Design a protein around this ligand. Structure first.
Ligand SMILES: [Ca+2]
Ligand SMILES: [Ca+2]
Ligand SMILES: [Ca+2]
Ligand SMILES: [Ca+2]
Lengths: 101, 101
């Protein structure tokens, strides 16, 4: 995965955004940008790649009660345990549409 | 923040997606969906809200060498330490455009 640096040049980082000029398969180059803010997290001082989608390591997702998401999720030890989270924490109803905030 | 459940009904969760029918400010209801996969993470078995954008708790971001993102990031103890991450880990050059994978 990755390896962009091997076929790109003039890379730069401003804030959360990486910009670089990269080689196209069909000759020629293209300059593009990517915002790393959401795919990179700060964990107790060290930059780590954002954790994988939870559906990759959790099963049997259900709505518990009126606003809780419940599931059986894998521990680092590879064992499934019960867990839940209140979606009312961050999911809002903004004029009829569900929005994260 | 949040509190969608107080003005919505017929909520349901399928996989990573929450769907609910919510009250509009201007009378009437609207049914909408939101995918929780990326805003909820599995940390050692418990569902936690995905960590905040790293630019919120990190400063002085720079490109170190050809592919590393370097910065000074806040620890849980509120002290800034040096950290870096190799963007070649997950940032690819897909036919001239930077893409995460
Ligand atoms: Ca509900
Ligand atoms: Ca549970
Ligand atoms: Ca580079
Ligand atoms: Ca550093």
């Amino acid at each position: 995965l990755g390896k962009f640096s091997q076929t790109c040049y003039n890379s730069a980082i401003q804030g959360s955004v990486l910009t670089s000029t990269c080689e196209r398969t069909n000759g020629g180059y293209n300059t593009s940008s990517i915002d790393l803010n959401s795919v990179i997290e700060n964990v107790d001082g060290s930059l780590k790649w954002q954790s994988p989608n939870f559906i990759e390591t959790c099963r049997n997702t259900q709505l518990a009660g009126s606003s809780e998401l419940a599931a059986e999720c894998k521990t680092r030890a590879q064992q499934f345990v019960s867990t839940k989270i209140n979606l009312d924490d961050h999911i809002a109803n903004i004029d009829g549409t569900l929005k994260y905030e």
